[PDB]
């Protein structure tokens, strides 16, 4: 039935040479098409699952995505019956012709990691995506099972393992699997007799004689389980045993965390350009980590003092902050300090703030300087290094290589998905965003790291219909620069989902009166309802009694708050029902950020266009997380709602924050919030691409709530539960330390294979990143 | 021996901060020392093994080389007993301080090809150096023994094997080892009965039925063996069988040879800048190669017509030459042609000759055009591509990648060894020699190719005392650019020694009278003995009856012709015994080559300084090999000798030519001739660094020869027999075709592992070569 397909195919051409997302790809052609559809059936499934379609004059190329992480590419003749299967490289040719007019010159670069990763087989099952350690535990457990040469790495590992000159686990006396096998048995025999609560100090003398150093446990009971797990691993390995053992071995003492860009600090920062959830995440992370690290250290019978350092930039000139000081104790922790190192060039240190899109030329020297400073601060080298975002992941990768430390990376966001078609359109965007530097770093850190943590499944593989954040890096091209044929694989065993949370001392249900912070109510009321218009707040709320539609975020284009303002301004029904309150941007000072400055001008116009005075309150950056918690709960009092209208949102901590306070939430369906919220149950999804619908959806909510105030309560509970089940810090740390254990061991078992990748990556950094990063215009004081 | 040892490092550290050379390094120290020479204990064995030593005040660094192919680097304390073993990369660190003042930026590029070669085990035996095919054969032979998943590749090979639309060996009717085994057997039984000389045509009908296509042999006998061999590979694989069979499969039909630089032609060229033994080598090669290819095509029952294309630059302004015509038939061949393609830019084609040192920016476009052209010339694609020197090897790799063809490289020289310390001092030599480009190319091709051909062992691994040419590329560094930690390995199984020869119809014993070409006597006698001084010959021989000390070569610095002249001018004894005749440089025209110009001036000066007139004849480039053959024979008549005083000579075809004609040779001990000649037996060695001794050795020889004439004859015979045994063209062809067969099959079996190394190279060409070559300033017409 070709008379039909050609209908759709001639639909596509009318659009002309260009990119088409499934948004349009199906939208225009299938539904906006005449009843000639009469389709269902085959080719509807195919078209529906098509992720994007590249239209050039004679042909349309289709990237088809049947299942998450499964792709096939196709060229079809616009007017013709012909359909040919494209290879990934071939499809990317198309994209390139669309822009340069020409596919990349024959000997232009193809990045291919596929042949490197081939060391260990790939899972094909949806169930292991974001579960990679489970896959690895099972593969190690098999490789280890009765293989002499296979067990040795474990022995050597334990035998060399030490911290600060104090030997741990096994001593130099155990040279082979028999001696070890023997000692473990003698030790189990001895220990099996003594009382459960017997301290390690009692039998310590005996152990040292037979070659057993500290770290097996604090008391006899614990030590015995350890030694049994090990006998079991030498004997009949199984995944749970392997994981349990490797996780329990004391390893992580000194931790190094990289977060160079933005103003990273504990006060007077959140809401400035580049300063946001990542900062909030890390501060919550180390506190939890330190608590867990102490616990384990003790349980294993050790007195070691842990140290966690957060490496960021020293910013001499940002007044009102502590960003100027080299060392800062993290609030509410004993062992976590922030360690600030300055950017510099031959001419000396660079004072001024620099956008995260511009920091590339400063990162290498930063790595050098950082290694020195943490060397001054740490006693013994780092046992774990975690990279954060692009710059951090970059720096974290260089250090991990330099010092030989187990590496983890966390994206926190991936710009290629926040800025659609920014890969194929990279060149027109470069003077401004330098995405050629950043995509390079991303691709680099991504394959350079030992493991990767994501906050959600969708961050890796997306959903059934839409592609993941990482998955979108599998095949792309930057025409004129290079072409990534396989840059990452959603099925990679290194991906682990470990979900964060909000700090339950700061954020809790609005309904616990005892804990409500009333001392903030005077300020909050002035902040919302006052009649004064100034750099802190603009316009004025006429009716103090309505529900409040609330939002808070950095002000940049993707966050798309100006968009919400418009949706709101246009909808008379929604303006009638509720007041709009938007926290974003800091109007106290001159904005040095491109998008934010731009975004502020829109905001000012929108205020005039829709005559927003009386329904709208535009608040500047709210920098105190403690008062912020109260603010949310106050929105709760008005029986209002939180809305997150981002064009794309990588994770969305504020979504978690509101749900946690019991504030019903409407979040963008693009990115992480799609996973966080179960629509109808834990809150509602809205599409930033249809805003008027978004507004009407909200109007519907406030109307239902008016007629039935219990509707409100339903979602508030739905949300609260979702958070209890899904996003909380208690479990996070333990997961992290265990991951660190397993991948740490895997690192040695698999070292021989990863040398080819080691050197490929080295060359990529040296001959691609460095040149690009050096071409970036330097900040001038 | 703590007393003695302290005493050497003592004298060493006085020399200052500089390069320690072995000859230099040991010379001063041990011999300029005392009876402390009682060091004939262990420490001395390590000193003479030292290849070079880096001098920096606190430490000295030593590269030690116990056996060829085995290096260990170490640093002891300038004043101390401390000796600490160095990683190769740390030794190279040392070398980098000496120049730039500090090491290479911490994150600047290290090339390591080691982990990319691991697909197969390294031979550790001196016996296997240059013998790699023998080694690769025993690996295949073993991997091929009763591993089904192993044998399939051989079947796929024979099944897919075809040429020019005609199907060869196995048909598509054979889908598996089972029916293959069945058919072959069925074929054996039948053929075993027929008369030996029965033509394939007779039993062809039957064969086509059972799945057997042409190529097994011309008669029943030959088909019988070929089939029996294959049956054997399926049953009990052994190296002799594996090789013998893979060599028999008709394979090489179309051959592409790359030689872009120089004036490449059959006349009016030899002696011009860059135009030399490579050109002479290649013409002899294709002629020989064509005879074998026809022979092999006939024997396997095929009628295919071969094609050999020699690809070089088209030079439209080189007059007197054929260098401006796109296609030229090679002398004395049916199927070999020179194919010339022009260099060009956006601006159009580039007419003027460019030094081989400057060709780099044009080579990539050369490849594209070349491909288009050799495509028009060839029926089907290349079955083999052979690269030559640096530019040729660079182009040959790009082509083999683009076309998917078996690749072989032949160095012909490696400049890094011709220009001492040109790697470490590369920066100041670069605006002139562009060695950053070249060395990059050299390493790129060296690893990129399937197999490598060398003319001698020394070219690869050197000698026990001295380092080999490729071997010197194993670890080196170019401060500020990159560091090669492992660039090549002398034991790599891809190395193969196949020695060239002289064309026996041009060069032969001076004592076969019927053959002497006497029609050349008048011209030659004028050349040597006339009293006319002009651009053809300078100065004058006063005495026509003295023996002639003879040399012929391109005129450049490394050839050190000016050196020979000085030595001779200074030595009254030698001047008394013989006349000096030197052919080099073309003074008919104005020289456009740097080194030639510089070298010409030296020559002129030496003429006046040593008042050489009457003892000396300086002859311009002799471009006709035919008469050139006679010129050698004529020197023999005078009972003269050939002398080759190069500072380094990669091979020395003129040494082969001289020995072939009966002319006793004295050749430089640096480079290939060290292997060609057996001192005292087939000729003599002289050390260009001690030239006065060179001059005396010559003097001694002539004196002895005057007292006992039969002394001359001994060497002449030694020289002849030596040539007969080692260097002759007959064997060359077979070996080369067999190599292609074996390396060809291997290409398929080992492809998966080579996939990693394939991308490493691609990125290295792309991000390192391309940018450098583009830095090279273009020629201007
Ligand atoms: O003016 C502001 C804007 C943001 N935030 C905090 O910054 C974080 C933003 O995290 P999210 O992931 O939602 O946004 P992003 O990380 O992209 O900045 C949340 O803790 C907010 O409460 C804040 O305290 N004040
Ligand atoms: O004026 C000259 C100089 C060189 N040759 C020939 O060029 C080749 C030089 O090759 P060789 O390997 O000796 O030195 P290369 O030029 O390759 O460095 C030999 O065949 C010489 O006979 C020549 O015919 N005329
Ligand atoms: O979305 C990317 C941006 O958001 C942050 O979370 C801000 O704290 C960082 O990851 C980055 O600046
Ligand atoms: O260095 C040797 C030089 O001479 C050649 O043999 C050409 O005659 C080339 O290999 C190179 O240009
Ligand atoms: K230990
Ligand atoms: K075939």
Short mmCIF file of C-alpha atoms in Angstrom, two decimals, chain A residues 36 83 116 140 145 170 179-180 219 284-285 304 325 471 536 562 628 648 655 686 708 726 753:
data_model
loop_
_atom_site.label_atom_id
_atom_site.label_comp_id
_atom_site.label_asym_id
_atom_site.label_seq_id
_atom_site.Cartn_x
_atom_site.Cartn_y
_atom_site.Cartn_z
CA UNK A 36 -6.41 8.82 4.89
CA UNK A 83 13.80 2.10 2.24
CA UNK A 116 37.43 -0.45 23.76
CA UNK A 140 33.15 -11.32 38.68
CA UNK A 145 34.95 -19.32 40.52
CA UNK A 170 46.41 -9.34 55.10
CA UNK A 179 48.65 -19.87 52.90
CA UNK A 180 45.68 -17.49 52.77
CA UNK A 219 34.69 -7.54 67.70
CA UNK A 284 23.87 17.15 51.51
CA UNK A 285 26.08 14.37 50.08
CA UNK A 304 41.23 6.47 61.34
CA UNK A 325 38.81 31.77 51.71
CA UNK A 471 21.56 7.70 25.60
CA UNK A 536 14.37 42.29 46.37
CA UNK A 562 9.60 33.95 31.78
CA UNK A 628 13.41 28.38 52.24
CA UNK A 648 14.41 20.64 30.10
CA UNK A 655 10.55 19.19 42.71
CA UNK A 686 3.00 19.56 32.19
CA UNK A 708 -13.32 19.70 47.06
CA UNK A 726 12.15 7.00 46.28
CA UNK A 753 42.14 -4.41 29.06
#
